[PDB]
Every structure is written in C-alpha cells, then in structure tokens.
Amino acid sequence: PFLELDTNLPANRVPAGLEKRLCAAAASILGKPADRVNVTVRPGLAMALSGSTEPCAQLSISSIGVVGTAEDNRSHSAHFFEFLTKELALGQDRILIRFFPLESWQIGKIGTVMTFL
C-alpha cells in the first residue's frame, strides 16, 4: 500500500518516527505486511481544510484490491482516524482521507511492473 500524508504542522511538531509507526498501523488495518507499506509525509505545507487554516492533515491511501468499496473503506477510515488523531493531536474534523484503488500494471517494481512479478 501507498500512504501519503500532507500536513501544515511544521516538521518539528510532527512526532519522530511517525512514518515508521504508520507502516505498522497500515499493516494491521489493511492486512498487508509492514515491509510492503510505503509512507510519504510532507510537513510544513500551507493548507486549508473545510476552509480553515487551523492545523490539519490529508491522507491518501492507494492499494490493490483492499480499498475499493464503501464497506471496506468505512472500516479503514475508522482505524486511520483513530491513529492520526492520537499521533498528531488533531480533532476528527481536521483530517480527511482519500482512497485510490490501483491495479498491478500501474506499479513499477524493480525495473518491471507487478503484473510480471
């Protein structure tokens, strides 16, 4: 899975090791091995969420097969909100998540695409 987190919290207000803990959490939530989780955190951005520039975070989750239905994503959402609100000390209203299903022919790995691995 691919997790991308944008936040307007400065880098020195983002807990150390967040990207690593997010890997373990994602493994537990999406059911994929932690060594297959990819995380990108981009802090110190200028953001408005729900029209407000108060501290917030946007998370994007992309994966093959496990984020393609409302029922699945409803569950994932619950857990990721729990993890983020705690780690970043943000209210539930200051976080939004977007889910993106991917297919194997879209992922380049070790010089080829996953379709052939």
Q: Which of 21, 40, 31, 38 is nearest to 75 (CA)?
A: 31
For the chain, the domains span 1-117
Q: Which of 1, 15, 33, 55 is catalytic?
A: 1
Q: Which of 43, 37, 38 is nearest to 58 (CA)?
A: 43
Gap between the Cα atoms of 10 and 104, Å rounded: 35
Q: What DSSP state is assigned to residue 14?
A: S
1 is catalytic: yes
Q: What DSSP state is assigned to residue 55?
A: S
| Dihedral (Cα; 114, 26, 77, 61), 10-degree rounding | -40
Q: Which residues of the chain come before a gap where C and the next N are over 2.5 Å apart?
A: none
Q: Which CATH architecture has domain 1-117?
A: 2-Layer Sandwich (3.30)
- Extended strands (E) in the chain: 2-7, 38-42, 57-64, 95-102, 108-109, 112-113
